[PDB]
Design a protein around this ligand. Structure first.
Ligand SMILES: [Zn+2]
Ligand SMILES: [Zn+2]
Ligand SMILES: [Zn+2]
Ligand SMILES: [Zn+2]
Ligand SMILES: [Zn+2]
Lengths: 368, 318, 132, 104
């Protein structure tokens, strides 16, 4: 490949914390950045600091009342803000902190600029881990997400590409993104997620899309604790079929750390290389890529995961030994660069997976 | 002023973040290619975007908790929506608010003169509609309430129940575990209908067992793999295997529904006489006069199916 | 900001709202052992320490770039000033700065020193606890 | 309706008493099935001759002590349905009216 990889990072993303016990900390972005920098990778990517987005750009997908409420709400002014809090689901699940507007603007600006750079051809690989809030849908904060900048990325890519493909690998289904393109045939959303009594709850197998988006939405229902050898086996053939058949011009991938082995909320049994297998397979097709970072609440794991992936995209394999980052204490007893899977029993039987393959491929048989 | 004397209060560590080890924890939690400073320069502000140039804890009407506009004359609690007319909490009345009953008891309720008021209202409506005059007068004395069914329409159907706050509820509301395959009352295994096996695997080899849900209606055991399913049904509705009637049909549109369960006191069972051709609904029995359930005489089902297939043949055959 | 193409490709008719898809019952979480919970506690304490230290360091650097200029990204500093001046005097002192920079800068540096010392001791404790 | 362990409602004079079934009698085999069951008539178990040859059942009256277990056949043991509940309530109301007439 030897792709020209651009990169985006704002130094203000590690200075906005959620609630004390809240599992969502963007500090993981910052030690992931330090993992990237101390490995000497800074000589291989084009580092940028994208401009934060403005209200006129969030109103492209979100609503004027929603954005206006976002720009004015504050922990100090909360007590008089009662109707909007319940109306837009901005209460406890998605709490309000000091720099919420700033963080949302940073994430949206970074992802929207990444899509812009992919459009102009400055890079064929744009990476923005700050974005990836695949749960909020145009009017409400959901799943700790407040702004679905991903849809802005696909909007900008569609400005140049006739077809854009979205892949979700977060153990959470890409509800907001699939909803944003449930009816259009330009975008395919393909979410690999856990299906059951899980927080998304959506992503049913028979969710091929409505309207013109019929047969243009793929949902992969999975059981607990899938491992690398099974995740790759369920991943690769479907991606092969979609690329061979839907044939997107652009493609967007959501790289969430939630499916990591031993995630604070995750339940999957993916190690480092099982996760990197999907990235390698995606980069194996040549079409431009816009990598974001979604789930993951074990920052010592997601930082290592993201550093390994950014090494992999530049077609290099990083060292297994740490370069003595600043936050050295975070990286366990051995201080290596890997995620060790646990001994739990994987319940994803081959027969259920085979039926899933049969259904998905039969549905795709009509997407030349 | 010199310094913040109340500087270190508390932190997540429990300590004020300025004390440190917390010796009790020490005894508890013990046994006995450059740096990032170069990022300030290689960060280039990219703005090449195509759009860069732009009293009570319940409402006295809903009997639920939530926003409460309580009163002072009468200790009542109301939801803002559960109020006639619905008042916007943004523009607060900012004054003494009394319930409709309180308003009537203060303005009108002179212990004897209330008869004068009701008589006057009746005589302003006796010439006009007067059957409703008493009700029209009296409903002005009442607080708004959430609408509920009158405790007997529900009883007409012995298949419905009221939820917690008053909601609808019906008959479908609801490591290695080899014991799930055992009946435990007959000692038998759970032979799934689709697979005709239990697929117990083994304790030595747990990776061969197959999960079973044993449908919640007719208790038929089923593999999670025999019918595609990701997880069990535990929180939501009762699972039902696909060996049950649809009870609802969309045909091209047109909608069909099966009648509800009524008390057998009011159930009027009926049996036809033609026994070959008799157009009935899905309300059949295999062996106010509107919910008659046909006793279908099962062989009539076979007959009706047969000539129906015959007609489906001759429509395309002739 | 919704452009015509945005009106074309988006979708506002069909929504899922997982609560509707959840039968309004809830979601079943995953089971985690107590060791995992202790790891979570250690991670949370580490994150709080490092977040406070990084915010204080960023504001310290900004105040240094201000004071070296006056010798002759909009909420971080106000937040850290309010945290340091937790006596509710942060509100007045922020505006007083907007019109006293060296004294607040040196107080921030002192707080940074104490926080880093406590962080080192806590790092020792955390590592000792985690290793088993 | 009529099964081992199932609920039942049996007549007793001008009122009914609900009970739970424990033994099911089979007059053809002269045998009853009980639950903690092919077994002959017990050494201390017997049924009245007017219900020894009928489908009799051993029932326990709820709200009554365990010493009031009775062998009641199909004559009084009715089918527990909505009609059974409505008719139990009907005769309870008639008993109430009889009590009120005895009083007022
Ligand atoms: Zn996730
Ligand atoms: Zn109310
Ligand atoms: Zn009142
Ligand atoms: Zn089976
Ligand atoms: Zn069934």
């Amino acid at each position: 490949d030897k792709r020209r990889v651009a990169y985006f990072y704002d130094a203000d993303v590690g200075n906005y914390a959620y609630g004390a016990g809240h599992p969502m900390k963007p500090h993981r972005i910052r030690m992931a950045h330090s993992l990237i920098m101390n490995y000497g990778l800074y000589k291989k990517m084009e580092i940028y600091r994208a401009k934060p987005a403005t209200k006129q750009e969030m109103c492209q997908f979100h609503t004027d009342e929603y954005i206006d409420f976002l720009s004015r709400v504050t922990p100090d002014n909360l007590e008089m803000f009662k109707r909007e809090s319940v109306k837009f689901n901005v209460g406890d699940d998605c709490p309000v902190f000091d720099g919420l507007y700033e963080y949302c603007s940073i994430s949206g600006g970074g992802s929207m600029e990444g899509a812009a750079r992919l459009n102009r051809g400055k890079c064929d690989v744009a990476v923005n881990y700050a974005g990836g809030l695949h749960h909020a849908k145009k009017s409400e904060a959901s799943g700790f997400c407040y702004l679905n900048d991903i849809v802005l990325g696909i909007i900008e890519l569609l400005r140049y590409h006739p077809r854009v493909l979205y892949i979700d690998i977060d153990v959470h289904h890409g509800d907001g993104v699939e909803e944003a393109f449930y009816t259009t045939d330009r975008v395919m959303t393909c979410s690999f997620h856990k299906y059951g009594e899980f927080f998304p709850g959506t992503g049913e197998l028979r969710d091929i899309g409505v309207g013109a988006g019929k047969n243009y939405a793929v949902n992969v229902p999975l059981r607990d604790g899938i491992d690398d050898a099974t995740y790759r086996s369920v991943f690769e053939p479907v991606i092969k079929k979609i690329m061979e058949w839907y044939q997107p011009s652009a493609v967007v991938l959501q790289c969430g750390g939630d499916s990591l082995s031993g995630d604070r909320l995750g339940c999957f049994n993916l190690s480092m290389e099982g996760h990197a297998n999907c990235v390698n397979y995606v980069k194996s097709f040549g079409i431009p890529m816009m990598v974001v970072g979604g789930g993951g609440y074990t920052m010592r794991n997601v930082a290592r995961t993201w550093c390994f992936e950014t090494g992999l995209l530049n077609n290099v394999v990083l060292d297994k030994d740490l370069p003595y980052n600043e936050y050295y204490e975070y990286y366990g007893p051995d201080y290596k660069l890997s995620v060790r899977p646990s001994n739990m029993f994987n319940v994803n039987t081959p027969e259920y997976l085979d039926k899933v393959m049969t259904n998905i491929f039969a549905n795709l048989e009509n997407t030349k | 002023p010199s310094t913040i004397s109340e500087d270190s209060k508390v932190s997540v560590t429990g300590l004020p973040l300025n004390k440190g080890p917390s010796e009790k924890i020490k005894r508890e939690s013990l046994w006995n290619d450059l740096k990032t400073f170069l990022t300030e320069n290689m960060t280039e502000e990219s703005n090449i975007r195509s759009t860069i140039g732009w009293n009570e804890d319940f409402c006295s009407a809903c009997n639920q908790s939530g926003s409460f506009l309580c009163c002072d004359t009468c200790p009542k609690s109301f939801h803002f929506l559960c109020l006639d007319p619905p008042i916007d909490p943004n523009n607060l009345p900012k004054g003494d608010w009394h319930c409709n009953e309180c308003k009537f008891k203060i303005f009108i309720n002179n212990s004897m003169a209330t008869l004068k008021k009701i008589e006057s209202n009746f005589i302003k409506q006796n010439n006009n509609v007067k059957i409703f005059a008493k009700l029209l007068f009296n409903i002005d004395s009442h607080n708004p309430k959430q609408f509920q069914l009158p405790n007997y329409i529900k009883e007409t159907f012995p298949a419905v129940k009221t939820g917690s706050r008053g909601q609808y509820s019906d008959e479908n509301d609801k490591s290695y575990n080899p014991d799930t395959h055992i009946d435990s009352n007959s000692g038998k295994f759970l032979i799934c209908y689709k697979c005709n096996q239990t697929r117990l695997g083994s304790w030595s080899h747990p990776e061969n067992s197959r999960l079973i849900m044993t449908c919640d209606y007719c208790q038929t055991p089923w593999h999670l793999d025999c019918v595609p399913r990701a997880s069990f049904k535990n929180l939501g509705s009762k699972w039902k295997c696909p060996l049950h009637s649809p009870t609802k049909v969309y045909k091209k549109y047109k909608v069909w529904k099966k009648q509800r369960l009524i008390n057998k006191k009011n159930q009027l069972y009926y049996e036809p006489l033609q026994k070959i051709g008799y157009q009935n609904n899905g309300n059949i029995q295999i062996i106010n006069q509107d919910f008659k359930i046909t006793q279908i005489d099962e062989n009539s089902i076979k007959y009706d199916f047969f000539d129906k297939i015959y007609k489906s043949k001759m429509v395309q055959k002739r | 900001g919704r452009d015509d193409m945005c009106w074309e490709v988006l979708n506002d008719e069909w929504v899922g709202h997982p609560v509707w898809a959840s039968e309004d019952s809830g979601f079943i979480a995953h089971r985690k052992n107590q060791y995992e919970e202790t790891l979570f506690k250690i991670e949370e304490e580490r994150h709080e320490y490092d977040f406070y230290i990084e915010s204080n360091l960023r504001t310290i650097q900004c105040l240094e770039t201000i004071v070296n200029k006056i010798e002759n990204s909009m909420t971080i500093y106000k937040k850290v000033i309010r945290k340091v001046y937790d006596k509710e005097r942060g509100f007045e002192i922020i505006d007083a700065l907007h019109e006293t920079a060296p004294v607040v800068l040196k107080r921030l540096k002192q707080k940074d020193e104490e926080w880093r010392r406590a962080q080192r001791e806590w790092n020792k404790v955390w590592r000792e606890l985690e290793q088993k | 309706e009529f099964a081992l362990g199932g609920r039942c409602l049996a007549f007793h004079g001008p009122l009914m008493y609900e009970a739970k079934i424990l033994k099911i009698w089979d007059p053809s085999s002269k045998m009853y099935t009980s639950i903690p069951k092919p077994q002959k008539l017990g050494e201390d178990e017997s049924i009245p001759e007017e219900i020894i040859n009928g489908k009799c059942f051993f029932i326990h009256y709820q709200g009554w002590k365990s010493s009031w277990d009775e062998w009641v056949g199909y004559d009084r043991i009715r089918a527990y349905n909505e009609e059974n509940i409505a008719m139990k309530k009907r005769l309870a109301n008639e008993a109430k009216e009889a009590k009120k007439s005895l009083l007022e």
